[PDB]
Design a binder for this molecule. Structure first.
Ligand SMILES: *Cc1c(COP(=O)(O)O)c[n+]([O-])c(C)c1O
Ligand SMILES: *Cc1c(COP(=O)(O)O)c[n+]([O-])c(C)c1O
Lengths: 396, 396
């Protein structure tokens, strides 16, 4: 059966982690995967989630199966985080959310749903985008086409080319938007550019799929959800795939949500029974621990307060690391002006490094960046900033 | 987009849980889903897993992403539990296991793998089988055909009809076997019947997919893995989907494994990179907590000892509940002889109840059984045994 199965290519993000760790050069720098690191090079489990975990350890009586859609508490808090407390879609009972294994699991459940219950043949995804978007949507059967997005010379969002790109998208096509902290560019629409796109998918008939992995990392939790809320005020139907792996530092527990919105509660609940039938045919019901923790933290005035401060410290430490990196690069001999990365949002810096600058950096300096030139700024600390900038300016 | 989406039918196992709980009749009995209950009507979280959880709470430093295939420790213990310590496939490095969200997630990953990397068009599944088998394999693209299995008059495995059924299976087809505690019948092959099937899939060219949800519940952990080990000694390629939701009482954390075996380590690792590419395109990497606990318990001499006793108490309490149920039924006026359910293995009793005996029992006595007449014996306690038997004999 398995004799002529070819070996798959390694994952462009995760394949790095395999190589990094097998390397026994002592001064290597990771900058690959997109996990926060603190000033000391470590990804601690947050304190708000250690208190919540002690709590579940004292207060759980059963591990008996969650419903197909998970913890209801988790569901309404996620909807409030996305749409706002007292939003009109919450009140009209227009949204239905399923707890999922991370944002990837929410993105696939969406894809599986749409493939067997919808007309959609095409998902539109930005150029550039998360590398695994294409792989999740092709596995469901859907075709992935690309729209323009980043102007590389000017280091801006190329809004016009994004508009003219999408004029080849039909009514009935999915268009994926990153909510904030665009992965990989970190370049996001202004509010004014999002209400322009809000209005345009309304007369073009696109179904919006918002991907939210980094809410809380660009300006703040509410500030980051504005673009989606500009679409939500206008659209009868949306879907958002949300992840709490980054903002909760809960990466390996796999906590996310696929939230469905239709024109009214009857349609949304009818559509939701199919989405739940897709979830059953894949894994059965979602992993409890991680979602259990999000919901304990968001249900507690005190424990929520502590998380929101932990998330603000991260937002700020990455911002500090950005200015540091453009300053250090400067005085380390930097051949170009890298000041544009200051204006980018989130964990990443989309540097202009070529695939070979990036290959040379791993294979002789041991600093790991994705082959697109995406480097994780949250993986930089004041101790490794100098090694790292000396490596980039010797490859320039 | 979602206007003419029809509502899905409710799940035959999980849809029960929705109805049970919405019912506010005080004496209702659940008997539906296949979760263990102790003498007091409760599914406690085991003590071996509460000690292991205290431990992770004291000893974890990060929630940073697991590899696509999860915890390696989890992987080798699962292989040892399935194949035996010092098995030849472990030593020849012939097996590769990925940690998954429960046994359902392992069964889908298998299906996704085989669909894009194999010739297989057909998975053969028993009649009767777990209701969701068909749904997981059809979602991957595969067709599901059925083979004969249970003789309902005699209450036996109908081995001949199982043989003649499968003579319509081609070389290259998947045939799914339940390892032990057949869901729904609880009727399993003898060892002699399994080495006969072991030999027959070898000259017929079937790929064996073993489903293991209840290892430790029929005779014991090693005793229960004998059939699979009879196939493993003969086959160059197998796949087993394993779950630790039942034997670890870890239902909602979602801990299982998809373990791949090929003729040699090169092929198995080549095939495994594709299986890992399927896992990435669905959820990304597995939920850590539940697998983390299995591996702490199995890595500890003491904590393992405590689990194995907890699993023996369950095995025994269900056996006690079986004799009780056939005894009580007898003296409650039982119209037929139900002594055959004594000879069945696992949590379930495949009673001969018709869909209408089963509908009448929920809708007027409030005892919930699956529409196949599958009743969960682990949901019976000495306090609810009499209500329950009075209900069955009034519907007979
Ligand atoms: C991190 C990330 C994901 C994956 O989320 P998780 O499954 O790890 O939670 C998905 N998408 O799409 C983007 C853009 C991410 O940055
Ligand atoms: C319980 C059970 C499953 C599902 O396993 P989990 O995902 O809940 O662990 C799958 N199969 O196939 C059978 C027979 C089961 O009894």
């Amino acid at each position: 059966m398995f004799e002529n199965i070819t070996a798959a290519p390694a994952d462009p993000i995760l394949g790095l982690a395999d190589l990094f760790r097998a390397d026994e050069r002592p001064g290597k720098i990771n900058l690959g995967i997109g996990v926060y690191k603190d000033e000391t090079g470590k990804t601690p489990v947050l304190t708000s989630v250690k208190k919540a975990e002690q709590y579940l350890l004292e207060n759980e009586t059963t591990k008996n199966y969650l419903g197909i859609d998970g913890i209801p508490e988790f569901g309404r808090c996620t909807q409030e985080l996305l749409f706002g407390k007292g939003s009109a879609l919450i009140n009209d009972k227009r949204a239905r959310t399923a707890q999922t294994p991370g944002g990837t699991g929410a993105l696939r459940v969406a894809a599986d749903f749409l493939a067997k219950n919808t007309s959609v043949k095409r998902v539109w995804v930005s150029n550039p985008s998360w590398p695994n978007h294409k792989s999740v949507f092709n596995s469901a059967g859907l075709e992935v086409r690309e729209y323009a997005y980043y102007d590389a010379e000017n280091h801006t969002l190329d809004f016009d080319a994004l508009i003219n790109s999408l004029n080849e998208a039909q009514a009935g096509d999915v268009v994926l938007f990153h909510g904030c902290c665009h992965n990989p560019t970190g370049i996001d629409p202004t509010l004014e550019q999002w209400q322009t796109l809000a209005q345009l998918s309304v007369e073009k008939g696109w179904l919006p799929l918002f991907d939210f992995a980094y809410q809380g990392f660009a300006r703040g939790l509410e500030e980051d959800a504005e673009g989606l809320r500009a679409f939500a005020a206008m659209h009868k139907e949306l879907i958002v795939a949300s992840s709490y792996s980054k903002n909760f530092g809960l990466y390996n527990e796999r906590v996310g949500a696929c939230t469905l919105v239709a024109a009214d509660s009857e349609t949304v609940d009818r559509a939701f029974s199919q989405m739940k039938a897709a979830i059953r045919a894949n894994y059965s019901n979602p992993p409890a621990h991680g979602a259990s923790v999000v919901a304990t933290i968001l249900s507690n005035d005190a424990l929520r307060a502590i998380w929101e401060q932990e998330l603000t410290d991260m937002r700020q430490r990455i911002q500090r690391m950005r200015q540091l990196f453009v300053n250090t690069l400067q005085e380390k001999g930097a051949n170009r002006d890298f000041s544009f990365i200051i204006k980018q949002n989130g964990m990443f810096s989309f540097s202009g490094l070529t695939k070979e600058q990036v290959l040379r950096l791993r294979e002789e300096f041991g600093v790991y960046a994705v082959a697109s030139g995406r480097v994780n700024v949250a993986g930089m600390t004041p101790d490794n900033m100098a090694p790292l900038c000396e490596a980039i300016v010797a490859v320039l």
